[PDB]
Enzyme design. Sequence first.
Site, PDB file in Angstrom:
ATOM      1  CE  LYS A 106     -10.554  -6.741 -13.510  1.00  0.00           C
ATOM      2  NZ  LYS A 106     -10.915  -6.576 -14.944  1.00  0.00           N
ATOM      3  CG  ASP A 107     -11.070  -8.246  -6.379  1.00  0.00           C
ATOM      4  OD1 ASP A 107     -10.651  -8.155  -7.551  1.00  0.00           O
ATOM      5  OD2 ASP A 107     -10.512  -7.695  -5.410  1.00  0.00           O
TER       6      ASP A 107
ATOM      7  CB  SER B  83      -1.637  -2.036  -8.123  1.00  0.00           C
ATOM      8  OG  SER B  83      -2.559  -2.116  -7.050  1.00  0.00           O
TER       9      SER B  83
ATOM     10  CG  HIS C 296      -2.106  -0.929   1.054  1.00  0.00           C
ATOM     11  ND1 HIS C 296      -2.354  -1.629  -0.106  1.00  0.00           N
ATOM     12  CD2 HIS C 296      -3.087  -1.275   1.919  1.00  0.00           C
ATOM     13  CE1 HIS C 296      -3.441  -2.364   0.049  1.00  0.00           C
ATOM     14  NE2 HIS C 296      -3.904  -2.168   1.270  1.00  0.00           N
TER      15      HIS C 296
ATOM     16  CD  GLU D 234      -1.768 -33.855  -3.119  1.00  0.00           C
ATOM     17  OE1 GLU D 234      -1.912 -34.261  -4.290  1.00  0.00           O
ATOM     18  OE2 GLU D 234      -2.729 -33.596  -2.368  1.00  0.00           O
TER      19      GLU D 234
HETATM   20  C1  HEM Z   1      -1.211 -16.898   1.006  1.00  0.00           C
HETATM   21  C2  HEM Z   1      -0.321 -16.303   0.208  1.00  0.00           C
HETATM   22  C3  HEM Z   1      -0.456 -14.863  -0.353  1.00  0.00           C
HETATM   23  C4  HEM Z   1      -1.431 -13.954  -0.182  1.00  0.00           C
HETATM   24  C5  HEM Z   1      -2.736 -14.058   0.637  1.00  0.00           C
HETATM   25  C6  HEM Z   1      -1.065 -12.770  -0.927  1.00  0.00           C
HETATM   26  C7  HEM Z   1      -1.797 -11.614  -1.009  1.00  0.00           C
HETATM   27  C8  HEM Z   1      -1.509 -10.563  -1.844  1.00  0.00           C
HETATM   28  C9  HEM Z   1      -2.454  -9.573  -2.304  1.00  0.00           C
HETATM   29  C10 HEM Z   1      -3.943  -9.534  -1.922  1.00  0.00           C
HETATM   30  C11 HEM Z   1      -1.808  -8.718  -3.096  1.00  0.00           C
HETATM   31  C12 HEM Z   1      -2.410  -7.495  -3.817  1.00  0.00           C
HETATM   32  C13 HEM Z   1      -3.301  -7.990  -4.950  1.00  0.00           C
HETATM   33  C14 HEM Z   1      -2.689  -7.602  -6.263  1.00  0.00           C
HETATM   34  O1  HEM Z   1      -1.939  -6.596  -6.298  1.00  0.00           O
HETATM   35  O2  HEM Z   1      -2.946  -8.312  -7.266  1.00  0.00           O
HETATM   36  C15 HEM Z   1      -0.427  -9.139  -3.166  1.00  0.00           C
HETATM   37  C16 HEM Z   1       0.564  -8.515  -3.884  1.00  0.00           C
HETATM   38  C17 HEM Z   1       1.782  -9.055  -4.221  1.00  0.00           C
HETATM   39  N1  HEM Z   1       2.250 -10.268  -3.757  1.00  0.00           N
HETATM   40 FE1  HEM Z   1       1.278 -11.580  -2.506  1.00  0.00          FE
HETATM   41  N2  HEM Z   1       0.144 -12.993  -1.544  1.00  0.00           N
HETATM   42  C18 HEM Z   1       0.546 -14.267  -1.213  1.00  0.00           C
HETATM   43  C19 HEM Z   1       1.708 -14.864  -1.635  1.00  0.00           C
HETATM   44  C20 HEM Z   1       2.645 -14.287  -2.460  1.00  0.00           C
HETATM   45  C21 HEM Z   1       3.654 -14.992  -3.210  1.00  0.00           C
HETATM   46  C22 HEM Z   1       3.862 -16.516  -3.223  1.00  0.00           C
HETATM   47  C23 HEM Z   1       4.377 -14.107  -3.890  1.00  0.00           C
HETATM   48  C24 HEM Z   1       5.555 -14.496  -4.807  1.00  0.00           C
HETATM   49  C25 HEM Z   1       6.305 -13.593  -5.436  1.00  0.00           C
HETATM   50  C26 HEM Z   1       3.850 -12.786  -3.597  1.00  0.00           C
HETATM   51  C27 HEM Z   1       4.293 -11.578  -4.083  1.00  0.00           C
HETATM   52  C28 HEM Z   1       3.498 -10.479  -4.305  1.00  0.00           C
HETATM   53  C29 HEM Z   1       3.815  -9.345  -5.143  1.00  0.00           C
HETATM   54  C30 HEM Z   1       5.109  -9.146  -5.956  1.00  0.00           C
HETATM   55  C31 HEM Z   1       2.794  -8.493  -5.104  1.00  0.00           C
HETATM   56  C32 HEM Z   1       2.777  -7.154  -5.875  1.00  0.00           C
HETATM   57  C33 HEM Z   1       1.426  -6.856  -6.513  1.00  0.00           C
HETATM   58  C34 HEM Z   1       1.564  -5.689  -7.447  1.00  0.00           C
HETATM   59  O3  HEM Z   1       2.513  -5.687  -8.268  1.00  0.00           O
HETATM   60  O4  HEM Z   1       0.716  -4.768  -7.374  1.00  0.00           O
HETATM   61  N3  HEM Z   1       2.793 -12.939  -2.720  1.00  0.00           N
HETATM   62  N4  HEM Z   1      -0.276 -10.270  -2.391  1.00  0.00           N
HETATM   63  C1  HEM Z   2      -3.099 -22.548   4.080  1.00  0.00           C
HETATM   64  C2  HEM Z   2      -3.749 -23.384   4.896  1.00  0.00           C
HETATM   65  C3  HEM Z   2      -3.882 -24.915   4.683  1.00  0.00           C
HETATM   66  C4  HEM Z   2      -3.459 -25.696   3.674  1.00  0.00           C
HETATM   67  C5  HEM Z   2      -2.705 -25.293   2.387  1.00  0.00           C
HETATM   68  C6  HEM Z   2      -3.840 -27.059   3.979  1.00  0.00           C
HETATM   69  C7  HEM Z   2      -3.596 -28.165   3.196  1.00  0.00           C
HETATM   70  C8  HEM Z   2      -4.001 -29.453   3.470  1.00  0.00           C
HETATM   71  C9  HEM Z   2      -3.836 -30.596   2.604  1.00  0.00           C
HETATM   72  C10 HEM Z   2      -3.179 -30.592   1.209  1.00  0.00           C
HETATM   73  C11 HEM Z   2      -4.348 -31.663   3.213  1.00  0.00           C
HETATM   74  C12 HEM Z   2      -4.364 -33.084   2.611  1.00  0.00           C
HETATM   75  C13 HEM Z   2      -5.784 -33.614   2.468  1.00  0.00           C
HETATM   76  C14 HEM Z   2      -5.746 -34.871   1.645  1.00  0.00           C
HETATM   77  O1  HEM Z   2      -4.806 -35.020   0.826  1.00  0.00           O
HETATM   78  O2  HEM Z   2      -6.662 -35.718   1.801  1.00  0.00           O
HETATM   79  C15 HEM Z   2      -4.865 -31.241   4.501  1.00  0.00           C
HETATM   80  C16 HEM Z   2      -5.474 -32.033   5.449  1.00  0.00           C
HETATM   81  C17 HEM Z   2      -5.986 -31.614   6.657  1.00  0.00           C
HETATM   82  N1  HEM Z   2      -6.000 -30.314   7.124  1.00  0.00           N
HETATM   83 FE1  HEM Z   2      -5.170 -28.715   6.205  1.00  0.00          FE
HETATM   84  N2  HEM Z   2      -4.492 -27.067   5.193  1.00  0.00           N
HETATM   85  C18 HEM Z   2      -4.535 -25.769   5.652  1.00  0.00           C
HETATM   86  C19 HEM Z   2      -5.101 -25.347   6.832  1.00  0.00           C
HETATM   87  C20 HEM Z   2      -5.684 -26.145   7.786  1.00  0.00           C
HETATM   88  C21 HEM Z   2      -6.239 -25.692   9.044  1.00  0.00           C
HETATM   89  C22 HEM Z   2      -6.243 -24.212   9.488  1.00  0.00           C
HETATM   90  C23 HEM Z   2      -6.705 -26.767   9.700  1.00  0.00           C
HETATM   91  C24 HEM Z   2      -7.406 -26.868  11.075  1.00  0.00           C
HETATM   92  C25 HEM Z   2      -7.832 -25.816  11.780  1.00  0.00           C
HETATM   93  C26 HEM Z   2      -6.466 -27.924   8.865  1.00  0.00           C
HETATM   94  C27 HEM Z   2      -6.803 -29.221   9.175  1.00  0.00           C
HETATM   95  C28 HEM Z   2      -6.594 -30.318   8.371  1.00  0.00           C
HETATM   96  C29 HEM Z   2      -6.964 -31.679   8.687  1.00  0.00           C
HETATM   97  C30 HEM Z   2      -7.658 -32.141   9.984  1.00  0.00           C
HETATM   98  C31 HEM Z   2      -6.599 -32.454   7.666  1.00  0.00           C
HETATM   99  C32 HEM Z   2      -6.803 -33.980   7.574  1.00  0.00           C
HETATM  100  C33 HEM Z   2      -8.240 -34.263   7.160  1.00  0.00           C
HETATM  101  C34 HEM Z   2      -8.282 -34.433   5.668  1.00  0.00           C
HETATM  102  O3  HEM Z   2      -7.200 -34.617   5.060  1.00  0.00           O
HETATM  103  O4  HEM Z   2      -9.393 -34.389   5.087  1.00  0.00           O
HETATM  104  N3  HEM Z   2      -5.839 -27.512   7.709  1.00  0.00           N
HETATM  105  N4  HEM Z   2      -4.631 -29.884   4.621  1.00  0.00           N
END
Ligand code: HEM
Ligand code: HEM
Lengths: 64, 111, 241, 48, 98, 49, 78, 379, 162, 82
Positions: H227-228, H205, H201, H271
Amino acid sequence: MVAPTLTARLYSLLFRRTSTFALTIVVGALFFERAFDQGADAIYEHINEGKLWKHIKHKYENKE
Amino acid sequence: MAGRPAVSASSRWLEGIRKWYYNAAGFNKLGLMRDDTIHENDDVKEAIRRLPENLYDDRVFRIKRALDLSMRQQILPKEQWTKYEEDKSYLEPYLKEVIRERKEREEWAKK
Amino acid sequence: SDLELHPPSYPWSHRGLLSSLDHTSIRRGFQVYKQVCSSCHSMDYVAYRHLVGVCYTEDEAKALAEEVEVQDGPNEDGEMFMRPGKLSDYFPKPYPNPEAARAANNGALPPDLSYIVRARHGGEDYVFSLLTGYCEPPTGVSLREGLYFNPYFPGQAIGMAPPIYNEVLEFDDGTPATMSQVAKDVCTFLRWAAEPEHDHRKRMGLKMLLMMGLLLPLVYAMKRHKWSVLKSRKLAYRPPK
Amino acid sequence: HLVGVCYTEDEAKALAEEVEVQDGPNEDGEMFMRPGKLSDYFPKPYPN
Amino acid sequence: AAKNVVSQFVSSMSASADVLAMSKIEIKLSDIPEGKNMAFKWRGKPLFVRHRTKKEIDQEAAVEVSQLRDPQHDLERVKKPEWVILIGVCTHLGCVPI
Amino acid sequence: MLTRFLGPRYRQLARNWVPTASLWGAVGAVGLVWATDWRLILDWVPYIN
Amino acid sequence: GDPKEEEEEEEELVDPLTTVREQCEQLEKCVKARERLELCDERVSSRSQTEEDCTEELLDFLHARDHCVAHKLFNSLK
Amino acid sequence: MTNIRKSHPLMKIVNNAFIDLPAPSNISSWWNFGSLLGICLILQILTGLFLAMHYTSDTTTAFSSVTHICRDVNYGWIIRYMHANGASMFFICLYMHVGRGLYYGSYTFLETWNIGVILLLTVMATAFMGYVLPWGQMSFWGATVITNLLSAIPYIGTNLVEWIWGGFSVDKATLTRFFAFHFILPFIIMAIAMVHLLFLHETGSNNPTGISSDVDKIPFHPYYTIKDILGALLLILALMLLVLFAPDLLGDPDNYTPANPLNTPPHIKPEWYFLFAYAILRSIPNKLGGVLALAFSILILALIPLLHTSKQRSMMFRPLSQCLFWALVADLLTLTWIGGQPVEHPYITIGQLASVLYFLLILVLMPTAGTIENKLLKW
Amino acid sequence: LETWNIGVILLLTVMATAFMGYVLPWGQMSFWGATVITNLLSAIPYIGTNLVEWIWGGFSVDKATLTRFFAFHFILPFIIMAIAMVHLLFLHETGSNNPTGISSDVDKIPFHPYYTIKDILGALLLILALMLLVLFAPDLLGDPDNYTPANPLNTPPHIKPE
Amino acid sequence: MGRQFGHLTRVRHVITYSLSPFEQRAFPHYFSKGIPNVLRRTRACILRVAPPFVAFYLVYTWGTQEFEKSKRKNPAAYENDR
Ligand code: HEM
Ligand code: HEM
Ligand code: HEC
Ligand code: HEM
């Protein structure tokens, strides 16, 4: 959407005031959800006629 | 990239490839000169501040309309594109002085 | 042999995106399990109450459950005691421990049939082809005792006597109990035993498509309406002199 | 647990091996008796 | 869409159909004699089996109807005065009696 | 390091901050050794032997 | 053990699957592969010792026939 | 509009970043993934929390509890599959969020980009421990090979692996630790994501043109919220299509058999969103080299902002770099294809060539691409 | 008013977390302490039993309730951190209070050199007091009956919360 | 966050016109000019997008073909005979 059209009365009667705008959203949700379930389910039975339990349930429970 | 104008061409002359690349870059299709697309760092930003009012105001509208074109994902008509020969560097003289100023400032802290 | 064969894609009554399971086949499919599979194959995740509303009625399933005796924990004197099963009881386990199972067979351990449709590549197509794919071993292949040739089985040597043959059981409704027909019913059952949510999965899927097929054009209209101000916007540059 | 508290390691091993315990499914698939080890908990006088 | 998805998540914390299977249980009557009771599990709370005898049924009707907080008779609470089954919990908070 | 370019002014800057950077790595060395009782290191101190 | 019936009843019963085995028993794909199966069988059996088999040739013949079998099998069931 | 609005010292001003925030007008559709990522994050927490109300970490009752969730819990079958397929949507959205920054030069926001890599590492770590939770012969063995990679480190490799394992191998001790760690890490991601926006911010952007958009900023609320919302529906439609029509399309079938340490699955693989990383590690016979290349490929994102050469910033007007960008995307798809296949002679050559090209493109070809065009534009 | 109202919300959240965490050990004080308190919601008219079972996940406190509490006990403390940050946000705008009760704008001092070292000393007095219980009387406050496994058929001699 | 409308930049001598969203059609000339537009957009990028992914399919169609050939046995039964 022109002079004497349906939408003109639709806006003035309901959408003119935001209070009544929400009423048609909640009341419309009541009637839409009831019709949509019956409308969408009836298609499922037609696709799967003679397949699910209810289509063969009559064969038991003293009915056959 | 696409087939070069001559027949296919690997690398012929130097102005031909530059002219071919200019149309390939596609910033002329948006009505932008070359220096209207430069990266604004702490150097270029100062060199923009030294632009004359007539030139700076022209740059603002060229950018302003280009974003309108990009918003609609459109381009200017064939007659309104920036001709490669007619493209001129309105920012190179100002960049060079900031290059000269910064190099002198940096080397003064080195000697 | 150590070679792989791709199972054929058998058409099913539930192969479509909205097609549901044939519950008549499920009822016949269970008859294969309670007579053929249950002899040496376990299903420890499906209860006798699950068949209610799917392939058997409540009274039908209660009779099926009471047909088999099960254990009911400690008595008043702290001893085990048999009793007729109930709806809540899971399908009986042929053996107490896997070690007994490996002893009953020639070392091979029969996998649990609860998820065997979803725990194998190819799904019911592979299982149907595996059950009916038995053939004489080709010349140049020698099989040890207790091993049988099945090309659809990875390795082509499986510790399985052919479990399905013509008229191996008798169906309640009177359909012929042929080699292929019996395999089809158990494959239909083994899918339900693996994915009981199959019918509701498509039932909500059809509702989603009708719901989202209407909202997506409508939500797009709101996006266009709000953005129509900027899309139709004219810029004019009028500098001095 | 008695090792380092009230009995030595050799003393506790003798105490554990003094009482037979039932654990480990035989390859035939049946329970069988064996002398206890250090990791075994104190014997339960009754099953339930 | 919002009402359906919300109700699906709310419904997950309600029944857990494996729990609903054990809603109804079966138990013998000849195991325990008259007067004594047995405690076992039903709906997660202890319940007792009691067999009313001849010299206790009459005293049940001795108490006047207009004597408690809620007027309730004794001949309608049971389908037959021979037997009675009750859950061994306190009617206030759910505590077992002696 | 601790500089920006390669010049006599920065060379003097680097040299002037070497003794502090010299003894700052001791905290990274001894402190890490202290945290996990690095034996090979704890085997040389006489009082902690 | 696999394709036998209890017999002695009416016409001893028949299976739809074994009939359909004859469907891709004349198709071009599964007659050419059968020709390869014979060649492997003749070659392997002739040799007194050989660490080779006909699994690959049999699998190719089965792959062609079974896929054609799956096309027109379920219509004769249920 | 009703008053002078009075007040103001509250949390509403923090919400001006969602309503009155200036934004470029020409922001394309490749940007909803920012809001989609937030939608995905709170979706995993919502479904995950309700999954955690029936899941038990003990090995004797871990897999059986997952079956109880689908078979017994009312509407518990869908929640498990929007959780399993949501992570597929998370990493689908995550990889386009990174890709847009690569193409549009968003890594020039050094603070935001660096926090973005930290966010990427946290999710990949979080999704790894979640896969081990079902305990299904792919959870046990998928975690076996990956965690054992840490044994290649010297003087700490053996020590930390047991410290990670809580014993001598993956077992009940490891399973309970993963479930607790899998519970807390997503709430860390929310805090970092707020920090991620805080570093953005300040500078706004990054219009696809790449030039400053300060001359054509528009309010966020009437234009990008709608749009979102449309972008959110396209996410729900895509996620729900998997859940309601092919729930096990992406997951491996072998995961449905209970974990058996004595039995090894026919093919052991992670995966699909880690498959590209598996291909790079498997491309080197050395063990220490493989783990380093596995980490370097993920951590190479932080090195990208230091490799910029072009005087322009977005790849919109860089045709030479555009050809390389889609070569990298295609190669990243080749790495995904290689990872899911067994290590045999057609794939060792392809795997090594794809991996050597993955690093060669970003480290050498892309910086050389920017230098070449600089000569072609007389600057 | 803003900070104080958020303070009550913070108070309610902790008492919910503390009550839910007491049921986690499952020790005849956890089962029965939760039994009496949760059954109080059955007194609510026309919706009591509907939500009591919806809290319970069944007809009584059981394994279904236990798993839900542990998941709920995990999430709520992280909510408290978010609310506590909001709690400070509604206070720093209006400053702090003094024992005098008059405005202290005339005699404000920097926080860093004066209160950080004052809070550090206060922290140690907390660590000393907490560690005194843990190392010298760990079960002084907890009821002894909690060390027997939960038995729904048997009631404790006296029922009481923490 | 220290940045809002009012101090973003200095814009001079630029006039803009816009219409009310209720006085203009939301979907104007959708297929009349949108479809010819997408053809223009696709051509401008098909020479930089397609070739990188066309190569991957060639790798797919050959890497998989060789894999089955490896699993296929080869006629190397000589030197043993009968
Ligand atoms: C849970 C993971 C993430 C969340 C919730 C998140 C969230 C956000 C959001 C909401 C924006 C602004 C939306 C937009 O400008 O399009 C942003 C901007 C950005 N994010 Fe993330 N992000 C995540 C992971 C990442 C990752 C993996 C990267 C890898 C490079 C990254 C790099 C950036 C960059 C470079 C921007 C700049 C946007 C611009 O150029 O205006 N973020 N992020
Ligand atoms: C960014 C957040 C998260 C990611 C990316 C994620 C990802 C995953 C993935 C890939 C699996 C494998 C399921 C399968 O292959 O069958 C899994 C299983 C599971 N996750 Fe998460 N998870 C997240 C957050 C959470 C949270 C916040 C909780 C609990 C509060 C949770 C509870 C569980 C449980 C209990 C399982 C086993 C049950 C099942 O696999 O159906 N996860 N999660
Ligand atoms: C003779 C006892 C017995 C009978 C009857 C039996 N099975 Fe099995 N089953 C086994 C054994 C032993 C194995 C393991 C074979 C092996 O691993 O080599 C097995 C394995 C399987 C497999 C696993 C195949 C694989 O590739 O993993 C499936 C599927 C299967 N059986 C289905 C069935 C069905 C359907 C029936 C009823 C028609 C059935 N079985 C009847 C003993 C039996
Ligand atoms: C986990 C729970 C809580 C945390 C972490 C927390 C945190 C804080 C902190 C750090 C302060 C400033 C410190 C100070 O001024 O002395 C504060 C101020 C305050 N809090 Fe809380 N609080 C919590 C719960 C509560 C509760 C239960 C109340 C009940 C009324 C409350 C009401 C207030 C009030 C009135 C102030 C004003 C301080 C002043 O006047 O200077 N908070 N809170």
